[PDB]
Curated annotation (Swiss-Prot), chain A:
A GO molecular-function descriptor: identical protein binding
One annotated Gene Ontology cellular component of this protein: nuclear envelope
GO biological process entries: double-strand break repair; mRNA export from nucleus; mRNA export from nucleus in response to heat stress; nuclear pore localization; nucleocytoplasmic transport; positive regulation of DNA-templated transcription; positive regulation of transcription by RNA polymerase II; post-transcriptional tethering of RNA polymerase II gene DNA at nuclear periphery
Subcellular location: Nucleus, Nuclear pore complex; Nucleus membrane
Membrane topology: Peripheral membrane protein
Protein name: Nucleoporin NUP84
Complex and partners: Component of the nuclear pore complex (NPC). NPC constitutes the exclusive means of nucleocytoplasmic transport. NPCs allow the passive diffusion of ions and small molecules and the active, nuclear transport receptor-mediated bidirectional transport of macromolecules such as proteins, RNAs, ribonucleoparticles (RNPs), and ribosomal subunits across the nuclear envelope. Due to its 8-fold rotational symmetry, all subunits are present with 8 copies or multiples thereof.
UniProt lineage: Eukaryota, Fungi, Dikarya, Ascomycota, Saccharomycotina
Protein role: Functions as a component of the nuclear pore complex (NPC). NPC components, collectively referred to as nucleoporins (NUPs), can play the role of both NPC structural components and of docking or interaction partners for transiently associated nuclear transport factors. NUP84 is involved in nuclear poly(A)+ RNA export, in NPC assembly and distribution, as well as in nuclear envelope organization.
Included range, full protein: 7 to 442 of 726
Keywords of the record: Coiled coil, Membrane, mRNA transport, Nuclear pore complex, Nucleus, Protein transport, Translocation, Transport
Misc. remarks from the entry: Present with 8580 molecules/cell in log phase SD medium.
Principal localisation: nucleus
Gene: NUP84
Family to which this protein belongs: Belongs to the Nup84/Nup107 nucleoporin family.
From Swiss-Prot, chain B:
Gene name, Swiss-Prot/TrEMBL: NUP145
Species: Saccharomyces cerevisiae (strain ATCC 204508 / S288c)
Name this polypeptide is given: Nucleoporin NUP145C
Membrane topology: Peripheral membrane protein
Transmembrane region(s): none
Intrachain S-S bonds: none
Compartments in which it is found: Nucleus, Nuclear pore complex; Nucleus membrane
Length: 419, 163
């Protein structure tokens, strides 16, 4: 049956033109692609695993589109936040994310990135308690994480290191996926209290009593006041070798830094891009705080880089670092959406019809995207480009023998007359 | 009218810190907030002052220590979280270092976790360094009130230092 696909997308358009909000179209496009992603994936010829991934990718694209256009377009402007110098850093961070839409967009994108991150299954047969092997062998004169750092790592049993590896890797995957609560649960329950505690430093300080404008979200002060310190402390910890590469990786991510080579070598376009947007973000916040004298000089223990990249440049670098992946045609759209250069790319792939015909999803996707765009933002895509796109896709509806559902797509030109 | 060096001056000053009203010049959304700020201010001045007093005692003690983790603890005795964190970092005690950064945020999660770690050690725990346990006990939020208690430090430190 699967050669139903176009129906689903077409179907969604029917429902829209007929209850005469348009963001639902895309939401459905997403779900549609995802549903199809499942079909080709389950039981299939290994020629299908490929086009299955091109559907999952499809789906992620629609999601990213929804998220960003919702934020950008459903922008109806709220009330400005008036801080005082007595206010906590927490509030200033919030203010920053409110006022600077360019940067919040980065947040949105990171959220999307996390959403679609793979995490291993929870490690089984985890041991009763930490470093149990070393303790049992005798030779841990101190039971604290820093003991084998104070003096040769030869202290820790091999099996203990192997388990610390399992743990820190799992925690790392969870952190990259946004699963911070799960990471704290794992830390707690796996007898890694001190690491847990480390994960608690992630929050900026708020006090509901002082920072009135969040006395709703909070009933109790929380987060840590000397955060610039925390951050250097963690970063330095991240640079100290004789720690497991995933642990160092974790601290890197937390300090707004770029994890060690041993770990980073396995990160893909999404993972890598995520890492570097995290860096942009971290740097930008800490700079925002410095420009408002909410950082205390004592805490500038160490040099961290102060110069934030632009999303443009991060993308360019990550691209050159992952050319194969970068060049994949829906991930180009992903980037195009991220930079807003989107009608830009529409008109572009339009002129590539004048090695876009070779891949099937593309001509469809661009067309339905163009439709959505001009629905949500009348004017968005050049009238001509709509004409050209629908023209060509329609002729494929003909080549597929689905003339049945051509009128729906017609509802965008007087050129429709000619059908 | 008194010398800033005289013990008398100390009496009158400490008395000012604890009893004279504080003023908080910046306007506050509601008044219970104000009250909270006034409490933080007073607390900060009292604790800066105590650190003024115990200062040389502890600096002497740091002069004579032969063990890095003990020094880290003493820096916590001067309410200097940052230099404890730094020495930890330097003496290659990095995890501790991170933990240290919590001292003075009153995060009850961290509190109950630190205490938990302490019970687990104090039930088997073949051996834990004498000063790491002290530091954890500080993170527990109840350093004498306790079951790994710093009360015995009664004999090694000015009562003011422990307070």
């Amino acid at each position: 049956y699967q050669t139903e696909r176009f129906t689903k997308f077409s179907d969604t358009l029917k429902e829209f033109k007929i209850e005469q909000d348009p963001f639902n179209i895309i939401r459905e496009f997403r779900s549609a692609a995802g549903q199809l992603a499942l079909d080709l994936a389950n039981s299939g010829d290994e020629s299908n695993v490929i086009s299955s991934k091109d559907w999952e990718l499809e789906a992620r694209f629609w999601h990213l589109v929804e998220l960003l256009l919702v934020f950008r377009n459903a922008d109806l402007d709220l009330d400005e936040m008036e801080l005082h110098p007595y206010n906590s850093r927490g509030l200033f961070e919030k203010k920053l994310m409110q006022d600077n839409k360019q940067l919040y967009q980065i947040w949105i994108v990171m959220v999307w990135l996390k959403e679609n991150t793979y995490v291993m299954e929870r490690p089984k047969n985890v041991p009763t308690s930490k470093w149990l092997n070393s303790i049992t062998s005798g030779g841990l004169k101190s039971c604290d994480l820093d003991f084998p750092l104070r003096e040769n790592t030869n202290v820790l049993d091999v099996k203990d290191k192997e388990e610390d590896h399992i743990f820190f890797k799992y925690i790392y995957e969870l952190i990259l996926a946004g699963a911070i609560d799960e990471a704290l649960e794992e830390a707690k329950l796996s007898d890694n209290i001190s690491i847990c505690m480390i994960l608690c430093g992630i929050q900026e300080y708020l006090n509901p009593v002082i920072d009135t404008q969040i006395a709703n979200e909070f009933n109790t002060q929380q987060g840590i006041k000397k955060h610039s310190l925390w951050r250097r402390t963690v970063y330095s910890l991240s640079q100290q070798a004789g720690l497991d590469p995933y642990e160092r990786a974790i601290y890197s991510y937390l300090s707004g830094a770029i994890p060690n080579q041993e770990v980073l070598q396995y990160s893909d376009w999404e993972s890598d891009l995520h890492i570097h947007l995290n860096q942009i973000l971290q740097t930008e916040i800490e700079n925002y705080l410095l420009e408002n004298n909410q950082v205390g000089t004592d805490e500038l223990i160490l040099p961290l880089p102060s110069h934030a990249l632009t999303v443009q440049e991060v993308l360019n670098r990550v691209a050159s670092r992952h050319p194969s992946e970068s060049e994949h045609p829906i991930r180009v759209l992903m980037a195009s959406v991220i930079l807003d250069s989107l009608p830009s790319v529409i008109h572009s792939s339009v002129e590539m019809l004048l090695d876009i015909i070779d891949k099937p999803y593309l001509l469809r996707i661009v067309t339905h995207l163009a439709i959505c765009l001009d629905i949500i933002n009348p004017g968005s895509v050049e009238e001509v480009d709509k004409s050209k796109l629908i023209t060509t896709y329609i002729s494929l509806l003909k080549l597929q023998g689905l003339y049945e559902n051509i009128p729906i797509y017609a509802t965008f030109l007087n050129e429709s007359d000619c059908l | 009218y008194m010398e800033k060096t005289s013990s008398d001056y100390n009496l009158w000053k400490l008395s000012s810190i604890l009893f004279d009203p504080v003023s908080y010049p910046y306007k506050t959304d509601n008044d219970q907030v104000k009250m909270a700020l006034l409490k933080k201010e007073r607390h900060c001045r009292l604790t800066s002052w105590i650190v003024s007093q115990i200062g040389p005692e502890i600096e002497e003690k740091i002069r004579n220590s032969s063990n890095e983790i003990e020094q880290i603890f003493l820096y916590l005795l001067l309410n200097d979280v940052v230099r404890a964190s730094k020495l930890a970092i330097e003496s290659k005690n990095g995890h501790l270092s991170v933990l240290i950064s919590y001292l003075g945020s009153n995060d009850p999660r961290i509190r109950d976790l630190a205490e938990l770690q302490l019970q687990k050690w104090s039930t088997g725990g073949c051996s834990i360094d004498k000063n790491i346990s002290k530091i954890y006990k500080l993170l527990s939020g109840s350093p004498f009130e306790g079951l790994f208690s710093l009360k015995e430090l009664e004999s090694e430190f000015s009562w003011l230092c422990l307070l």
